[PDB]
């Protein structure tokens, strides 16, 4: 239990910063709308820029942010981790910042 991609209450820009030093175009993190009282969202590096998806709720507890929805945040990650995200290339959610635990 933890969050290898979720953040909590940060600014999309902060997620646009940790995603800018990333290396795999797919790196992602989820943000709880720092401007809202609690609006889920997610930043991800596609090519080098940081585009984010708005996260919504089905009103029952589901979470979505693009096309298909799910029943868990990390669930939407793994899904988009094997499924592309944009119709322009094949990008997927990946791990951002934190480096590969133990990287010098």
């Amino acid at each position: 239990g933890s969050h290898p991609w979720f953040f909590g209450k940060i600014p999309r820009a902060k997620a646009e910063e940790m995603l800018s030093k990333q290396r795999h175009d797919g790196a992602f993190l989820i943000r709880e709308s720092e401007s809202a009282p609690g609006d889920f969202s997610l930043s991800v590096k596609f090519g080098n820029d940081v585009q984010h998806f708005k996260v919504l709720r089905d009103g029952a507890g589901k979470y979505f942010l693009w096309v298909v929805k799910f029943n868990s945040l990390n669930e939407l990650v793994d899904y988009h981790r094997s499924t592309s995200v944009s119709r322009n290339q094949q990008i997927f959610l990946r791990d951002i910042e934190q480096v590969p635990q133990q990287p010098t």
Binding site: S41, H52, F53, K54, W66, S86
Partner: peptide, 13 residues
């Protein structure tokens, strides 16, 4: 000054 989020509904608001 918000960048929005790719899926984010259009700015129609």
């Amino acid at each position: 000054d918000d960048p929005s989020y790719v899926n984010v509904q259009n700015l129609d608001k």
